[PDB]
Design a protein around this ligand. Structure first.
Ligand SMILES: [Zn+2]
Ligand SMILES: [Zn+2]
Lengths: 96, 81, 129, 87, 125, 100, 216, 24, 208
RNA sequence: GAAGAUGAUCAGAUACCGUCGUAGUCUUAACCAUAAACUAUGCCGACUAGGGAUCGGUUGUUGUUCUUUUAUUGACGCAAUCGGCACCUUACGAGAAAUCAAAGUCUUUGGGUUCUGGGGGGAGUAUGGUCGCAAGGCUGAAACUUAAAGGAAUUGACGGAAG
């Protein structure tokens, strides 16, 4: 019988079972645990300002070979330090 | 066999079926009239008897229970009722 | 164990119809089975059917005429309001011009088309097409 | 199938199996159509005058075609006491 | 080895299916005949074809060969297999004049509307 | 995937079968899985059955046979060519090989 | 100059058989694509996908070209052909031939009222090939072909105007998707509906009434 | 590495962690 | 229905019984049960030759309905039936397929002996499996001489008889030929003795 | 026969192989609660297809052997049947396929019900709890990282595999 209850009075079992099993969905789990609020460097925001600490070149992964030019930024809102890419040919010279 | 008379099975094939697997289940057991050799007194005995039945007149065992049908003792003649 | 004799009856009919047999034996019988079969018989999906009395729940022999595509139960018997019949016919029936959803209403067991004529609704019971 | 004005918009009303009433599809190449001649009282086959049966490929595949012809032919008088309703 | 190939085996048997009446059992006559029947590019292939045609012809005279039909093999065969004995070997005359069917079969005969004399045989094994 | 419907053994309707040791390497192998061969060999090779019969003090003395039942694990048997790798369709054939 | 090699071809070269429904009514096998060309002159094809398949060998890959072609007249007949060849052009040319040989009739029906010509399917149908299952649901007169571009092209060439679609499985396997949809669209003449319950007499096969014209 | 030996390595490493925490 | 002249005559019953037609195989499949009259205590099954006769008349009546006699193909891979089918083709005008049946004769339209029979008649469903299998590809009905162990897949008309008898095969084929000619009018009526003898249609060893 | 000791082999082998060997292997009282604990296939119920074997019970019957000379002896033989452990063929049907009489009766989707999974890793880890004498068991994350990992099958290549 498909392994789930079908009785007309089994709504509690069906409702609880779905509630237990949505925790296997990482999109649902991250939303209720508030992982973006607790763990994300931005704190759930789309953008964040910061202060440039140093300009650093990062080697690309194989099979590519290049120096990806990023910066070390300390976020103003929480003091966390992140690495941010500086796009467009020669835009690292715009960042001090 | 796509077309077949389920309401009127062949009585030959009907008799080979298990007693519960006929259209209407019916026991295959019966009752017998048992004549002991010593005297003549009708004693009704179940065919599948589980008891060592003795006739009233003389205390002689008429049948001994077995796994299935009861086994009538020697000199005892039965007639199905 | 045996929890729904109507599901067993309709499953046996479906298995016999898929194999091209023109008759099927149903055990046990019941009032709901007989009235479900009468609805199927009235619309021509089955032929004459026969009730066998064995001083028990009973048995039925149904004559099939090859017009039956599928008959089935809906477990559980959901409560169906008149406004909910449209949703059930959309999900269960192959088209809007044929097929029937069988309901048990306080006015009796009937197909969804008859239920609309007398403006009654009950619990869903099955389907046939 | 017909429209509101009554014209038969159906192309190809298909055949149905004589044994199981199933529709014989356009590409069911295991399906056959038995044609059995009518015989006059002289014992002669009447030319161009036949008893016709159709069997779906399903019935033939199951091996039930032979028993179905026995039943179908017996109802039409083509056979006597060869097929028995009760088994 | 001296195994002839397919270019000589099939080309030679086409000659038999096409020119059997004009062929013979002599290689020398066949060698000259195949030079006027087929366009053979080389003399060596001509001798090989005629040498295998002669072998097939020599084999047809000893009986029917498999794979070669020359519009006279069966014409001679259609009326060759007409043999039928005067006694039917199935007519009930080899016996005393009645069937030797088993007694169990006689019930089937009795079931049909037949009165056929029988000497029942009961093997019962 | 599953190579054999019998799982390479002969255990159905059973929980556990006590093991046997391979004759060649003494490996514990379940009794149903072991490759078993019953051998009835002459105790004297056919070359020596004549001269030994002449040296016998008994007229018409029958030489006894040597009875033995051999148990092999899968590795013992495959290496000694007691059984061989068969094709996928030929694996299903379980009648004795037609040699005798 | 086409010289038919089958009984059916001879009856079509002569005017004995004039429509494909006589072919379909008796389930006659079609083995010559010239039969379909004569009986369905206005056919449109479409190369739905071209794929390269490789067989590894000792020296290297052996690449061949696989073409998927959908044929139809947009008036109730549709076929599907898949053929592999060394070259794309030969693969497409040969896939068109077997697409013609597979042309089947479909049943158009009405969603709701039967006003006008049939525009949709007469019932829900499903076909399966590999893991792909394609379900076609009759739709009202407004909605076009609600289907993916692969399945939509098959519906248009078959003459269906209004249909809902839903697929499950690896629908990106285009060959399996088209075969499943082709099986589904052909099931319309396999589903018994109450308007087909009436018994029709079994007519004689065209190979019988014209036995001498199909002789040799 | 083999899963059985990877399991054994972690059990020994878990055993070390328990002993180290017991000092405090 | 049918005139009483088509009933099983005592003469034919003598032929059928003398040829051991009624002896069916030890093991009977479920589909051939109606054709069994009784099982002989050794194990052989007795064929209801009354049913055998009626199937022959029905089978011959289907053959007579084919307009072109050449459209009927009679097949036999068994050596015991090769002469029968060859003689059957000569008398009736059918197309005989004796010996090996080339796979693709019905489906491959470029083969040499590519035929399109409207009806295929088979000596044995087991040894002529290829002929029966291909008939299920091009909508060809099949008439088969079936024993009690013969498979019934894709066989429309089964003639219950002994397929493994030297005389049984020839007699059944001879009986079909007589009825096909009787229905066609070649034989003037159902009482005239036929010129052909059942010894013809019997397999002959290379000895003679 | 773990450990350990030893003779060989080896570049090294505290490995395979050889010789000894302690716990252990056995048992009684208690603990432990885990296995590829596998049919990797939950349990209950119904239906859908042919066949021959076999184990237990029952019911009818032999050119059979034997009690004892025969029965009410037993064995065997032939039939039915209920229950099992399985097997063979086919594929109506299912499946990605291998394959499956269930892994079928599932887009024509609903007989009842319990448990479990939601890309690969991190990880059955950390932490808390609880059970245990311990070994450990049960319950059990996250940060972070990653575009595949994986299933079945095909062609080839290779094999200190066979023919
Ligand atoms: Zn008494
Ligand atoms: Zn080993």
């Amino acid at each position: 019988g498909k392994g789930k209850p079908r009785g007309l009075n089994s709504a509690r079992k069906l409702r609880v079972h779905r509630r237990n099993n949505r925790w296997a969905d990482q999109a649902y789990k991250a939303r209720l645990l508030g992982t973006a609020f607790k763990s994300s460097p931005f704190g759930g925001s789309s953008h964040a300002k910061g202060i440039v600490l140093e300009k650093i070149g990062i080697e690309s992964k194989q099979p590519n070979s290049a120096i990806r030019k990023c910066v070390r930024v300390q976020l103003i809102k929480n003091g966390k330090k992140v690495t941010a890419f500086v796009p467009n040919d020669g835009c690292l010279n715009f960042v001090d | 066999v796509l077309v077949q008379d389920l309401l009127h099975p062949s009585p030959a094939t009907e008799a080979k079926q298990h007693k519960l697997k006929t259209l209407v289940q019916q026991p295959r057991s019966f009752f017998m009239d048992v004549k002991c050799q010593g005297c003549l007194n009708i004693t009704t005995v179940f065919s599948h008897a589980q008891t060592a039945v003795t006739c009233d007149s003389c205390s002689t065992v008429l049948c001994t229970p077995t796994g299935g049908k009861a086994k009538l003792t020697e000199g005892c003649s039965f007639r199905r009722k | 164990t045996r929890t729904s004799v109507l599901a067993d009856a309709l499953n046996a009919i479906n298995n016999a119809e898929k194999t091209g047999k023109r008759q099927v034996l149903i055990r046990p019988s019941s009032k709901v089975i007989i009235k479900f079969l009468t609805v199927m018989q009235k619309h021509g999906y089955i032929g004459e059917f026969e009730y066998i009395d064995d001083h028990r729940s009973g048995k039925i022999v149904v004559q099939l005429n090859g017009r039956l595509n599928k008959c089935g139960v809906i477990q559980p018997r959901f409560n169906v309001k008149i406004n909910d019949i449209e949703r059930w016919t959309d999900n269960l029936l192959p088209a809007r011009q044929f097929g029937y959803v069988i309901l048990t209403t306080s006015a009796g067991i009937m197909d969804h088309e008859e239920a609309r004529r007398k403006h009654v609704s009950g619990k869903i019971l099955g389907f046939v097409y | 199938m017909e429209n509101d004005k009554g014209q038969l918009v159906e192309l190809y009303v298909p055949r149905k199996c004589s044994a199981t009433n199933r529709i014989i599809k356009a590409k069911d190449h295991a399906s056959v159509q038995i044609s059995i001649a009518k015989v006059d009282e002289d014992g002669r086959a009447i030319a161009g005058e036949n008893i016709t049966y159709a069997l779906s490929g399903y019935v033939r595949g199951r091996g039930e075609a032979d028993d179905s012809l026995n039943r179908l032919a017996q109802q039409d008088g083509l056979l006597k006491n060869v097929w028995s309703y009760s088994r | 080895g001296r195994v002839r190939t397919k270019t000589v085996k099939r080309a030679s048997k086409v000659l038999i299916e096409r020119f059997y009446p004009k062929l013979t059992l002599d290689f020398e006559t066949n060698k000259r005949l195949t030079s006027e029947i087929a366009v053979i590019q080389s003399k060596r292939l001509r001798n090989k074809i005629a040498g295998y045609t002669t072998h097939l012809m020599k084999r047809i005279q000893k009986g029917p060969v498999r794979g070669i039909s020359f519009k006279l093999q069966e014409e001679e065969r259609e009326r060759k297999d007409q043999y039928v004995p005067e006694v039917s070997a199935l007519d009930l005359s080899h016996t005393n004049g009645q069937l030797e069917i088993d007694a169990d079969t006689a019930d089937l005969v009795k079931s049909l509307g037949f009165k056929i004399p029988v000497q029942t045989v009961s093997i019962s094994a | 995937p599953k190579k054999r419907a019998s799982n390479g053994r002969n255990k159905k309707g059973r929980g556990h079968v006590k093991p046997v040791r391979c004759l060649n390497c003494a490996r514990c192998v379940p009794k149903d899985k072991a490759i078993k061969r019953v051998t009835i060999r002459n105790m004297v090779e056919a070359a020596a059955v004549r001269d030994l019969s002449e040296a016998s003090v008994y007229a018409e003395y029958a030489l006894p046979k040597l009875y033995n039942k051999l148990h092999y694990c899968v590795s013992c048997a495959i290496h000694a060519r007691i059984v061989r790798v068969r094709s996928r369709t030929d694996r299903k054939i379980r009648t004795p090989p037609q040699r005798k | 100059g086409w010289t038919p090699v089958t009984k059916l071809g001879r009856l079509v070269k002569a005017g004995k058989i004039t429509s494909v429904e006589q072919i379909y009514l008796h389930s006659l096998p079609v083995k010559e694509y010239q039969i379909i060309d004569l009986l369905l002159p206005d056919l449109k094809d479409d190369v739905m996908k071209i794929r390269s398949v490789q067989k590894q060998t000792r020296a290297g890959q052996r690449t061949r070209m696989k073409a998927v072609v959908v044929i139809g007249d947009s008036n109730g007949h549709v076929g599907l052909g898949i053929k592999t060849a060394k070259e794309v052009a030969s693969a497409i040319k040969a896939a068109i031939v077997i697409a013609k040989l597979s042309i089947i009739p479909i049943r158009r029906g009405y969603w709701g009222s039967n006003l006008g010509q049939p525009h949709s399917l007469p019932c829900k149908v499903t076909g399966k090939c590999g893991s792909v299952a394609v379900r076609l649901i009759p739709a009202p007169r407004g909605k076009g072909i609600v289907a993916s571009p692969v399945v939509k092209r098959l519906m248009q060439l078959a003459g269906v105007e209004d249909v809902y679609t839903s697929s499950s499985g690896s629908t990106r396997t285009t060959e399996n998707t088209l075969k499943a949809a082709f099986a589904a669209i052909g099931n319309t003449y396999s589903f018994l509906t109450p308007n087909l319950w009436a018994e029709t007499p079994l007519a004689a096969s065209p190979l019988e009434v014209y036995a001498e014209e199909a002789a040799a | 590495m083999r899963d059985k030996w990877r399991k054994k390595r972690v059990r020994r490493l878990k055993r070390k962690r328990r002993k180290v925490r017991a000092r405090s | 229905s049918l005139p009483a002249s088509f009933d099983l005559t005592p003469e034919d019953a003598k032929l059928l019984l003398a040829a051991n037609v009624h002896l069916g195989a030890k093991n009977v499949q479920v589909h051939n049960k109606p054709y069994v009259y009784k099982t002989r205590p050794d194990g052989m099954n007795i064929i209801n030759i009354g049913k055998t006769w009626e199937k022959i008349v029905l089978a011959a009546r289907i053959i007579a309905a084919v307009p072109n006699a050449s459209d009927v193909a009679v097949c036999s891979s068994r050596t015991f039936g090769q002469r029968a089918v060859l003689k059957f083709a000569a008398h009736t005008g059918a197309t005989a397929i004796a010996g090996r049946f080339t796979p693709g004769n019905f489906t491959n339209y470029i083969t040499r002996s590519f035929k399109e029979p409207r009806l295929v008649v088979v000596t044995d469903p087991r040894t002529d499996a290829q002929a029966i299998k291909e008939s299920s590809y091009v909508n060809i009905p099949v008439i088969a001489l079936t024993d009690m162990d013969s498979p019934s897949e894709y066989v429309d008309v089964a003639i219950p008889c002994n397929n493994k008898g030297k005389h049984s095969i020839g007699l059944i084929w001879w009986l079909l030929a007589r009825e096909v000619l009787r229905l066609r009018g070649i034989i003037p009526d159902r009482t005239t003795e036929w010129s052909v003898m059942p010894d013809l249609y019997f397999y002959r060893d290379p000895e003679e």
